[PDB]
Ligand binder design. Structure first.
Ligand code: CUZ
Ligand code: CUZ
Ligand code: CUA
Ligand code: CUA
Ligand SMILES: [Ca+2]
Ligand SMILES: [Ca+2]
Ligand SMILES: [Cl-]
Ligand SMILES: [Cl-]
Ligand SMILES: [Cl-]
Ligand SMILES: [K+]
Ligand SMILES: [K+]
Ligand code: NA
Ligand code: NA
Lengths: 586, 586
């Protein structure tokens, strides 16, 4: 007998217990929440263009985005925190972009996106999870959609032998591709084991169809299990191919005339399975049945025997297949031996015991279902605190529901998502908070307060703006002191320090048509004294926080006087923290 | 007074938060302070496609080239000094715009770039007899014309202008040239008078010059005189704009027909009409006071029946350091933010008026500490004669230690305060991104939203018109129209299938995809994303949306529905096949 009795109210002056990291959904950012208050503490721009900080307008952000800076949209689903020894280490957050096929990395000490990669030769990065053990060496990323190779417009057929999709491994530390694995079918969600050897992904389009009925024809698709040691062995030996102009090593994980690859095993699982979730004790890859009212439990301890050819049938690694309810999509864990699964159709979370499910699969008459909690409505992902680590603490559960209906005030034709906080600390799940969120966060991740350490002010050698320091070095500028205008043909490079309530350069003059770069270094050493910089009617906007350098480039295409001002309320004289750009006519 | 809104309870008030330099408008539930919706206005929204869609870019006009905005002041249209819930208006300081949000669909439906001005800052609505005019301050003095021959702010032709926009047509109504500059503004409860603070009576560009004079002023406008001069044809026009321009400057000590300038210390900021309609209250900022302009003495002031403009001041209470903004409980109390002292000061307006007459009386009732450095504040219904004295939001600029650390950039602290009793009670600390400057609350029953679009809605009527030229009936048709190197795809959508699941174009074709969501159910929104083309939009029930992009890459390119709509949402996809350029002419 233990009761669910956790306090939910975080009063003024009190602090939240957990950080929540929410996908921004189709809006494209990452959002930082306090838990259990469910209040949004910060937005981290990633694939969106952020007017406030200038992400997507500044030179530093467009350098990180690369050529993909041309896109103003993203679609993210799956945020995950880097691990060491199966526990969060607080270093990085990774997230996917399904719209323009990217992975981004966020540095959790500065809460900014610091690296971004377009995954080559694929369309639509969806499933994403991190190696757990010995640490996050790889980011694993699913590309969802089968495409021709090459995709040059000569072949459009999905059934062609060179039409396929690929599992992707990115080096977490360098954010360069490590390798790709061609698979049969497609890829939905993915997870990793607690040794580093195995990773697994669900597949819903084993049929390689494009139409709705075609994609639901097979009784069973599969989860494909990857032998990462075997992949690495082959890469280290040089037996791989490359595709197109990408140097990425490409391994072939497809079955060929019935024969298995060294790199993959295909475990039949019903049906168009969706979630693929590693239990916190490291025993199971759990695939959520979706169209089948089940979850399928893959025993990780049997996978070495599967890849060694010691098992008669790939189904022999299935050790449980509990019937739970209508539309199982995702599973999480309290670390006490229970699994928690969203039922999309039944609109519930079901709590169930994994070892009892395994015994029931053997034919014991034991009831493994503990509780079904109604949620509102149609839940997708769910997340129990520390569930992706061997420290899963079984305290908080968030269920992320796609139809809010009447749970909030009406706000027009478009509705918010209902992210519901559930106390799981005791024997009964208890619903304690409905949190409306914009643009469908799909999944979220929680960390203990003590797992996250942030910088209070920037470091001057920070890699985030190191290329700007370099540019200034070429101009002979000491960013910490200098207030100067460099003229270079039709290029003008203003460098200034800023200190509330004044810009260090308060006027400058240019010729109509000049390309202007303005670089600002906030030399305050006080926490929270951010400055802004907006050029009126030029579409120019950016943030400069304490000890940061930020820069932005625009063309002075309009003759005349053009004011600039500080956008971040910084000082009693903030309205007067302004300057003039004077543009002499052509 | 209920503080906490439990699961399945609804908030009692809507709150409309400015998005600050992030450029959107945010809809909150009060008192829970949870964000229910984001309304993109000057930002590019990846989720809905605002800034990318043809409908949004049509509304933005040429300003669709800007990806940024800076908004501060949201206000709800009024009829007879009460909110009518028709429209929300907000300013853009970064690119000199005013936007209108239609509160039934919670979307920006009109936008205007105010001509011949720089930086739209202060903004407020006529109250009586209804909101005919939107009043908008241009904050910065510029040359006229601003063609790069004159840069000096002291030139005869260097000034800023007060701006009146027709609320219903969102076209310019008139502009009034003023001395000095403009900061905030408000309107009386008769329709005759509006008023604006000025902090740069010096027409300087540096900090000390802008602070030189002991008093700047509140400039009062006689809208009846302006209206009479425009009907009489007595105005000029500037540049290309047909907007009537009237001259509200003093010339040679002589007052204009349209303006009177009331001396007020010092670099005053806020400008707030009391809910009883008696006073324009100006916040003294650098002066530790507010200045109360008796609106009933204004007709006498404009008729030359007063010896000194100061004679319309009937109060100047000393309140504390850095008064910025004032709001009203409707019980004769005013609440003022003290930026430097970091407090809200509650004071009795009539008692302050007696103390100005010499009658010693303590008009200050309470000073509540806020965290930290408050800017604007807002009491529920404060801008109407229905000011109800229940809730107070103070919007503080430095949150320091009030929330978990999230890096060098800190959230703001919007603190909800109970003012229903004699004593202000701090009840909730609400972190917000990008510095909302101001907000506005409305009773739940003052807002009526549509659950599904009307098919004749002007938001997409231009698109319906385009479709008619192609002979399309958007409600039923699934057709691909070809026109040279343009392709216009029209389709219906019903979960979980796109009405046109595949189409083929030539490389380089300009593709418009128009989608009509023909669902009748609430909350069934679809999305549309073209992988790797930077294309993303929302289509809510009975909406038509369209987006245009270049099919610049040969090959097969997937599109998918981004808005979780169904159990088969992962499977709602389509294919664009792009034939290579080398296989087609040129
Ligand atoms: Cu992309 S899917 Cu269940 Cu993860 Cu939301
Ligand atoms: Cu623009 S000012 Cu007190 Cu409104 Cu914030
Ligand atoms: Cu710098 Cu406001
Ligand atoms: Cu249509 Cu999801
Ligand atoms: Ca299938
Ligand atoms: Ca002044
Ligand atoms: Cl998953
Ligand atoms: Cl338990
Ligand atoms: Cl104001
Ligand atoms: K939704
Ligand atoms: K701030
Ligand atoms: Na990169
Ligand atoms: Na317009």
């Amino acid at each position: 007998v233990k009761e669910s009795k956790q306090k939910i109210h975080v009063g003024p002056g009190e602090l939240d217990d957990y950080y929540g990291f929410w996908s921004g959904g189709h809006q494209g950012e990452v959002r930082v929440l306090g838990v259990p208050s469910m209040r949004e503490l910060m937005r981290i721009p990633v694939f969106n263009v952020d007017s406030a900080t200038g992400w997507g307008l500044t030179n530093e952000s467009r350098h990180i985005m690369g050529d993909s800076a041309k896109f103003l949209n993203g679609d993210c689903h799956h945020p995950h925190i880097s691990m060491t020894d199966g526990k969060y280490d607080g270093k990085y957050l990774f997230i996917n972009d399904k719209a323009n096929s990217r992975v981004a990395r966020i540095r959790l000490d500065i809460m900014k996106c610091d690296k971004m990669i377009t995954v080559p030769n694929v369309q639509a990065i969806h499933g994403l999870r991190l190696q757990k053990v010995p640490h996050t060496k790889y980011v694993f990323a699913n590309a969802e959609f089968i495409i021709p190779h090459p995709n040059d417009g000569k072949v459009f057929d999905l059934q062609d032998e060179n039409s396929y999709t690929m599992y992707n491994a990115i080096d977490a530390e360098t954010m360069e591709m490590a390798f790709q694995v061609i698979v049969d079918g497609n890829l939905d969600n993915t997870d990793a084991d607690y040794t580093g050897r195995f990773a697994a992904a669900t597949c819903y389009n084993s049929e390689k169809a494009f139409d709705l009925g075609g994609m639901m024809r097979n009784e069973r698709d599969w989860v494909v299990v990857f032998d990462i040691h075997a992949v690495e062995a082959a890469v280290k030996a040089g037996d791989f191919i490359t595709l197109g102009d990408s140097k990425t090593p490409v391994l072939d994980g497809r079955k060929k005339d019935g024969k298995d690859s060294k790199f993959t095993r295909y475990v039949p699982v019903p049906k168009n399975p969706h979630g693929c979730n590693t239990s916190s004790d490291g025993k199971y890859f759990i695939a959520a049945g979706k169209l089948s009212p089940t979850c399928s439990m893959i025993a990780i301890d049997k996978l070495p025997d599967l890849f060694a050819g010691k098992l008669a049938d790939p189904r022999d690694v299935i050790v449980g297949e509990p019937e739970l309810g209508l539309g199982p999509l995702h599973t999480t864990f309290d670390g006490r031996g229970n699994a928690y699964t969203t039922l999309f159709i039944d609109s519930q979370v079901v709590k169930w015991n994994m070892e009892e499910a395994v015994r029931a699969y053997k034919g014991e008459k034991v009831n493994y279902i503990k509780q079904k909690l109604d949620v509102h409505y149609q839940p997708g992902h769910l997340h129990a605190s520390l569930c992706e680590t061997n420290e899963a603490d079984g305290k908080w559960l968030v269920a992320l529901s796609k139809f809010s209906k009447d749970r909030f005030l009406p706000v027009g034709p478009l509705h918010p998502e209902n992210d519901q906080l559930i106390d799981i600390s005791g024997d009964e799940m208890k619903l304690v908070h409905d949190g409306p969120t914009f643009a469908e966060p799909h999944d979220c991740i929680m960390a203990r307060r003590d797992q996250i350490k942030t910088k209070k002010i920037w470091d001057r050698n920070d890699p985030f703006f190191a290329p700007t320091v370099e540019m200034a070095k070429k101009d002979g500028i000491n960013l910490d002191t200098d207030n100067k205008v460099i003229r270079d043909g039709n290029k003008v490079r203003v460098y200034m320090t800023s200190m509330a309530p004044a810009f260090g350069v308060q006027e400058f003059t240019v010729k109509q048509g000049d390309e202007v770069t303005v670089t600002i270094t906030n030399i305050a050493q006080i926490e929270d004294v951010s400055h802004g910089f907006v050029v009126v009617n030029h579409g120019v906007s950016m943030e400069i926080s304490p000890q940061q350098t930020s820069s932005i480039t625009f063309v002075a295409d309009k003759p005349g006087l053009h004011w600039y001002y500080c956008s971040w309320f910084c000082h009693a004289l903030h309205m007067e923290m302004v300057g003039r750009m004077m543009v002499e006519p052509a």
